[PDB]
Design a protein around this ligand. Structure first.
Ligand SMILES: [Co+2]
Ligand SMILES: [Co+2]
Ligand SMILES: [Co+2]
Ligand SMILES: [Co+2]
Ligand SMILES: [Co+2]
Ligand SMILES: [Co+2]
Lengths: 251, 251, 251, 251, 251, 251
């Protein structure tokens, strides 16, 4: 039950990822064999729920690619349910300040370190109580990544970075650009400056910066700067764009 | 991606609807061909979720009948997820005051006009980014309908009607009658008076009144008065009552 | 595990039925409360399989209406599977002769009386081996109804009626009329004559005649002639026609 | 629609239960025939949602075992949806004080006694309006059980017990032991003392104490003391432990 | 209910296609917007059944791309079921001779022209009896494409082309190459010769040649020779290879 | 893609197994961690299909227990489909003679050794063409186990054992006892004699004997005689009996 993605971030090994919005355990398996370090199961902007997350985790399990799950919001109840089906790495949307970051962290940790409700017998998390001493080992293998997506969140970043248990900070360029006045198009100097400055500040605090970016040159730039969990594409886009290009070649 | 139901309400063309509680993409298609102007996919009182809404939207898509979705509550997160699978017309339950109406409207609109989170690449809403300039066109095709179901909501109606982006106000007679002391039976003079007065006030403000009513004479009365989105039956009731009547004719 | 539908036919008590093509456990429960004696789960012309039959049987179980299941064909493998999930009354399509009727009966009976494969520990049919002496009691509670749908089958009817274990013979007017050249409209004197002559002959042999007929006058005419399992409507039709009628009443 | 579990608790008849985390309508039916007085469908720590609850209720319906449902939290919206698919007995997690207990009770009751939204036509709860006078009978057959799982909740127990409509109080030993410093292992004298004292206080107030405990001697002790709804095992554990023991006997 | 794919082949307009093996209604919709003339829902080599074909047909329906469905074999029972859920164009595997081609055609046609069973009230195919004179118009809109996959089938090609109702003949290079001893690599002169000779001969007879070929140079070569339904890629391949390429570009 | 179950049988290492009839990917994972050498996914007597087999194979994949799948019959079309979703070991029911055993073997092998249809780009079996030289390596990793279930099959056992590619012969005691007139109780000396004589004869030929037997004393007796794949319990039975025992201990 060692969290190898978390260990890698801690060791400063960059992790290359793919976003999964196809919401299917079948395509999840197909993509789990494609050579990515991590896969993001999106519960926020794709039609997933706890049950489809579970089946995608089962599909991915025997592959080297590590799963990360994004809940629909920073919700303790939804976090608890995701952890019980076996989620160990969470990407939490719209974290605006240190208090919200702390709530995310505590949602993942058993008392006294947190408020995670106990339900080990029922849960894939402990493999239905086959993992010995699960309750005592579980906290240290939880990896909490928080998303900063607004000017307010950027302003609060130093404080968010001071929250123990925050292992990484993810920047969402589309949401950030929208908040900043550029309508979801991050290719504006003011937006890139903010992103670059955040990546540096995060890495300087001893924590992992992350980002999703489909432009491969921008992705390489962010990696060169020091980002440690970079998603470089989205399943739905890869499929749609490859199919459209193919049809176009025949008229 | 033009919202034709919204255009019709704006133009004062009455829209006749059917309520869908069967929670099935198969019966949704069957009913999409029956000649209604709109169909209500009920996420509140029928066993639907974002995923079943998605499949019902897919089933209805090639038909002229327009889909409207009712979330379980006035919840920004649930609203965001519904919009991403392609929902453009929402019927929001238990809207009690202008602040709640405004939250519903802003949940549907991209910044700065609202707080809708961006996730276009992943979403059926933009047809996975095939709709050009989706981010810029999306706000104007969202149609927000709010439900008033209590005496408190009736008292606040003038203020609710002043909220920009509120395109229509739906009256739920059963909930209203319950709140007023008549136990969900709207056939009491005090309740009909309130309903009639609301329909008039709504239409006089330049907005669309709506209602669900299974009694066909009452429905015609409300249409005569000026209601613009009137649901005249419920799938489950049509099926149950037709089946029971049939069995009764044979003993 | 007494088959009450089977006992009713044997006692000459007419059974009024509804056809289920909505392929949903939810609408099946709704319809199970409507007052029919029997309900036909259609695995031939509706998108059902062994698994959806199972969920529909579970939904119907606490109600008085008795389930009957139609396999896609007279296939002993499919029959075995349907029996294991708890089917006790089968309506077998396209039975052309006495050998085929015999094959249907034998598919439902444990050796030596038939070729039904044994798997009671696994099966809802024995309630996972809770039903005492299941193996010894099962054969006698199976009820086999065979469909005659062609001129060939009509010619072989006397031999088919001589087959032990054939409890009922069902006439399918649409298929029969199509085979007879009146495709597929059964309102022609020569089709009605064939139908009515078969009903009389079936009942004369001491077996139960059955038919599906949405016209209530014809249904009563068939009952007068001795028909004992008469399906008088179809769920999809009831819903589609009620919905269309409603929408039309509002323009 | 009489709630027989509720009547039994009121009459002081102890009810022996099994916890269902397998989240399957198929295993639910299998277990519904095993002789338990009640079955707990766990929406909190197992991968269930309103839809899977519905199918499990349908599976259990014809059996004598009574269903109890645990929502993911004390959420009025989720409670409403569960009640509409037919839930009449709720086990509500993390109830910390009298105000929270009162919110749980009011979520289950139609106005004026509560805030339950009306949606009878659509709901299995009224059997799609076949239950006559459902709106007037529904409140009295709702049974609300609240979970106390923290030292804070224990402190507030006398006040929680004074809340009308609270029919029972369930103690979760694992969560309680975690809150008390013993890491989810309830076998510590301080924890057993607290549990024993709560069971007595609950029963002395005229209300039903409940608990889940897999140790059969502890369960018998709690029953001897006066507990009235005792779950004595969990489906997932029974299966896992029986399978592991079996494999071990062969090496 | 005009079959536009069928009309295009008859008019000599080449149709460019994509194979769908992802077995999902969600990715089917995504791909339906990509610009292909046709989409192949594979019931033979992908985990589809009648029910998933149905949901994929619903998803594709509002788009210009036309669905074609491949049953698992030339089985008249499976064909009947696929036709009832609305399939109008079938790609039938392993057709070895003219008798088997005739059997495929006849499975799709109502008597007297075939043996298709009647069940229009139940079926999406007639839109639940909304399509006027469905029974009279259906036969002419069925489009039957047969696969030749062995040396035996190649030998019988002239007789197969003489079968009325065979609208197209599809060559499966992998299966053919395997039968020819080059298992299963079709890049050998003798396989290419057999393929190209068949395409010429099929087109010469006035029927449509088809093929699946992921190599775009070969695809254009087959088009030059007169092939009229050419599938130029497979969804699972497009996704797997794009994902693998992306991951490799980042090390 | 080495078949380790197949290698174990060939090396004379007995494999202890559990039968899976719960038809759930969730309980399959739970049971995959219980310590059995193999797990039987039953497509004959449990409500599984190609799609639920797929999800169960995905769930079991990361565990040491090896899956074996039982098709509903010796059907080459069903076998092809199960092989494409990744099945490598098949337990084929009702194999009566050497021709039928040969047909089973040939259904699993690519030409020229068999008639297995080619579709690797689409199939989990090749991991969507990631497995290098899949077509060349697949045949040798297929493991075919045939069930002898009748006196006829027992008579033909010597010829069946002479069939190349038959790796194992499984005796089904319930079906065999039913065929022998002891329906379906296998505790009679003449049934036990037939069973034990077959086990000895199978092993003598250098092939693996198999059997399902819930009685642990009999299971050890069969192992002593040389049986090499012995299923020692059934999931549904384990769960039902443990639950019933528990409930009874509490009255
Ligand atoms: Co974002
Ligand atoms: Co309401
Ligand atoms: Co028929
Ligand atoms: Co608890
Ligand atoms: Co092929
Ligand atoms: Co057997």
């Amino acid at each position: 039950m060692e969290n190898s993605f978390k260990a890698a971030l801690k060791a400063g090994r960059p992790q290359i990822g793919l976003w999964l919005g196809l919401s299917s355990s079948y395509s999840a398996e197909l993509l789990a064999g494609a050579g990515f370090d991590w896969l993001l199961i999106d519960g926020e902007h794709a039609p997933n729920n706890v049950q489809t997350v579970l089946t995608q985790l089962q599909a991915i399990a025997p592959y080297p690619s590590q799963p990360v799950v994004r809940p629909s919001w920073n919700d303790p109840v939804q976090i608890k349910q995701l952890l019980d089906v076996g989620t160990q790495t969470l990407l939490v949307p719209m974290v605006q300040n240190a208090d919200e970051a702390r709530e995310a962290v505590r949602a993942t940790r058993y008392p006294p370190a947190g408020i995670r409700g106990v339900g080990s017998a029922l849960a894939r998390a402990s493999r239905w109580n086959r993992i010995p001493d699960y309750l005592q080992k579980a906290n240290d293998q939880m990896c909490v990544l928080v998303q900063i997506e607004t000017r307010e969140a950027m302003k609060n970043l130093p404080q968010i970075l001071d929250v123990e248990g925050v292992d990484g900070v993810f920047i969402g360029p589309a949401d950030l650009s929208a908040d900043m006045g550029y309508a979801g198009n991050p290719q504006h100097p003011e937006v890139q400056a903010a992103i670059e400055q955040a990546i540096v500040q995060i890495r300087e605090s001893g924590k992992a910066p992350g980002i999703l970016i489909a432009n491969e040159q921008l992705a390489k730039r962010y990696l060169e700067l020091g980002a440690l969990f970079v998603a470089v594409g989205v399943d739905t886009t890869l499929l749609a764009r490859a199919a459209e290009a193919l049809a176009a070649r025949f008229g």
